[PDB]
Design a protein around this ligand. Structure first.
Ligand SMILES: O=C1CCCC2=C1[C@H](c1[nH]ncc1Cl)N=C(Nc1nc3ccccc3o1)N2
Ligand SMILES: O=C1CCCC2=C1[C@H](c1[nH]ncc1Cl)N=C(Nc1nc3ccccc3o1)N2
Ligand SMILES: OC[C@H]1O[C@H](O)[C@H](O)[C@@H](O)[C@H]1O
Ligand SMILES: OC[C@H]1O[C@H](O)[C@H](O)[C@@H](O)[C@H]1O
Ligand code: NA
Ligand code: NA
Lengths: 391, 391
């Protein structure tokens, strides 16, 4: 049995109740921003690569009102979130910028306020609710950053592009959460359309909408319900390793390298740098091919490319873990499954599986029964991006 | 020189004021939908071809409220909307549907009601305001259709994708305006983003958002302020010729016919038929080449393709007119202009001109001086598509 995904009207109702209770009046404003699953194109976004994510119906909802006093007052019901559930801080000023602190969850909101490009931004009271499982690799943090950005636009309209908004949320993640992410998770939370995955070119920031609206195809998300500590620590190590191979080959990024130059340059780089760069160069090519394949309705070829994405992440990039590998092999053993692999950063989180709609009940019975741990499952249709909810 | 383009805040305040006066109270709901200019890819959309439009900062805004009485009550403030500018009608039933009638402007709204796919749709009171010049060839009608659709979604949510919404609006234009249009104008009004052109594959309905992020480059729109009576009568005639020469070549559409194949099948079709298909088949190739030139940043190559497109429309497709031709030749004579061409259906309306921002003032003086009639100008940037506006 797959996990009932609370609809937007439900998260919003919980967010109003906690707000009405907390601040003594109805919130004036509200927004939603989703999480995301990457179908293929892992560890390519900070390498100016290609990724193929879709937005989920798992989302973050902000409700709030402007204040007159220049303070920010937050409450989150998110029961994963670190204590306290409440936090207040002053707006940043010419005299004093905000700094990351405790609790961790509020760093995502502080960062987006700090880099919000439009002025004058008023103080606000807000409640944050989320159905995105925290640390589960479905971009909880990007959903919060983008929900915050969308809210701030209701207080104080911005004048730039949708990429610029993604880059603000990215800057918040870099400076306030110490996590040097690529643009994928912010971009998909912002640009997602119902019935479509997004081919994102992280060099040009061109995006292509790729239909998934075929009723006999299902995308299954399996949460391992594990997050090894490597998760936080090893991400910035892989990024600097890639940047060092590009610099050693005289390339602005690995986007500009192909496997043949890399083969030929292999004595300019560590054995390990070589293997990371070979994952990225291949995964860029796989994502381009997967996108054409999906557009063609060729799921088996999409499925092959997903499994080769997994192997490359497990062996060359080394960002899988026993739990993800076990979930992937288990899913591949099931008839009707085109392919399976880890999605997001790795070291835990979720696999994504493409399978026959009709094969999905058997798939969950098998994977759960064939998992050492306790899996969770989401049956996911491609959702819209961030939007305003008119209260 | 350039006509001022009201911002959404100012259109809302005008619409609220008209709504308060007309219906006795503040409206509850608001939406906006933009007009468009086609950069290249003219008369290809109904040939399952490629188009490269951008949304404009010219837009239509509906404000309104649900009713209990199953009546629709409309008022428009739009400059040359035909009389009456206010009317009331009951919602359609399965028993009886709406029909196109007087006035012409309300036909766009009636059509979208009739074909709106979700139920139950309540009655409503709405005011319609627009900065898109009625019949100026910037898709005033698509902006009204998409604004109406977006407004009905606030009364009664739909559950299809964005593409289906464009098709409902297309069907309203076919049945209620008698205009057998392609998908371009509805698609761009829905899916436009600030700082992006939209590459639409009208065969697959795949779309790519292509960034316009060179502030040295500008797009000048020149309204001829002329509409010949050919524009009504002659559009369905060109569409019919395209269909005949496709059947006559045993192809599903002219999208399936390569230029070199067409050029060697001169004897299968009428000389006229042949010239129509040569425009269409060539324009599909020019559109792909123009996208690649945008992505490369080659605005000189983009400009030359714009001029080939104009010549093709003028001589092969015969949908230009003396005023458009004078305005194009006038623009190309100005230093800093990469290219110029008629945009939209033809037989009047606007040219689009790609130029150095710094040259726009000289262009507007040279073009007006060298134009037999009275030119209007817009310097529009790529705008956002259809939105909800929270009152
Ligand atoms: O500490 C880390 C490192 C890994 C990434 C990470 C956090 C962290 C977190 N995980 N569990 C408890 C907490 Cl606090 N918050 C989020 N996302 C997050 N999305 C949220 C949405 C609403 C409210 C709180 C949220 O936190 N994401
Ligand atoms: O009669 C034709 C044939 C060509 C297409 C065409 C019309 C026609 C129109 N042109 N001039 C006066 C009027 Cl009434 N209305 C619109 N668009 C239109 N967009 C509108 C937006 C808001 C209000 C009225 C509108 O009408 N478009
Ligand atoms: O593809 C791996 C993925 O990992 C994390 O989720 C980052 O937030 C993204 O930017 C991306 O790098
Ligand atoms: O490209 C010419 C253009 O003409 C009209 O404006 C139609 O609305 C569009 O569908 C398209 O066919
Ligand atoms: Na188990
Ligand atoms: Na003149």
């Amino acid at each position: 049995a797959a996990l009932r995904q609370p609809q937007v009207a439900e998260l919003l109702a919980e967010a109003r109740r906690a707000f009405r209770e907390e601040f003594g009046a109805e919130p004036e404003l509200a927004v939603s921003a989703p999480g995301r699953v990457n179908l293929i194109g892992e560890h390519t976004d900070y390498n100016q690569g290609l990724v193929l994510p879709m937005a989920l119906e798992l989302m973050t909802v902000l409700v709030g009102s402007p204040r007159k006093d220049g303070l920010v007052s937050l409450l989150t019901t998110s029961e994963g979130a670190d204590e306290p559930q409440r936090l207040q801080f002053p707006l940043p000023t010419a005299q004093r910028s905000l700094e990351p602190g405790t609790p961790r969850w509020a760093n995502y909101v502080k960062g987006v306020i700090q880099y919000y490009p439009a002025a004058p931004l008023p103080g606000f009271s807000a409640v944050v609710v989320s159905s995105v499982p925290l640390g589960g690799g479905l971009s909880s943090s990007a959903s919060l950053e983008v929900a915050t950005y969308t809210f701030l636009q209701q207080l104080c309209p911005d004048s730039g592009t949708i990429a610029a908004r993604a880059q603000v949320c990215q800057q918040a993640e870099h400076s306030f959460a110490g996590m040097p992410c690529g643009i994928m998770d912010q971009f998909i939370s912002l640009m997602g359309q119902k019935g479509h995955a997004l081919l994102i070119d992280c060099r040009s920031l061109e995006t292509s909408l790729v239909p998934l609206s075929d009723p006999k195809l299902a995308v299954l998300i399996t949460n391992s319900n594990v997050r090894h500590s490597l998760a936080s620590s090893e991400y910035p190590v892989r990024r600097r390793q890639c940047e060092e191979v590009a610099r050693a080959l005289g390339a602005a990024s690995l986007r500009e390298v192909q496997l043949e130059e890399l083969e030929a340059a292999r004595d300019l780089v560590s054995k390990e740098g070589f293997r990371r760069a070979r994952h990225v160069v291949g995964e860029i090519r796989r994502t381009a091919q997967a996108a054409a394949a999906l557009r063609r309705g060729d799921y088996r070829a999409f499925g092959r490319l997903m499994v080769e994405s997994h192997r490359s992440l497990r062996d060359d990039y080394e960002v899988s873990c026993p739990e993800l590998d076990q979930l992937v092999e288990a899913a591949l053993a099931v008839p009707g499954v085109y392919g399976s692999r880890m999605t997001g950063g790795g070291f835990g989180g979720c696999t994504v599986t493409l399978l026959e709609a009709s094969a999905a009940p058997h798939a969950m019975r098998h994977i759960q029964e064939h998992y050492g741990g306790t899996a969770t499952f989401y049956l996911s249709q491609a959702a819209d991006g961030a939007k305003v909810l008119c209260l």
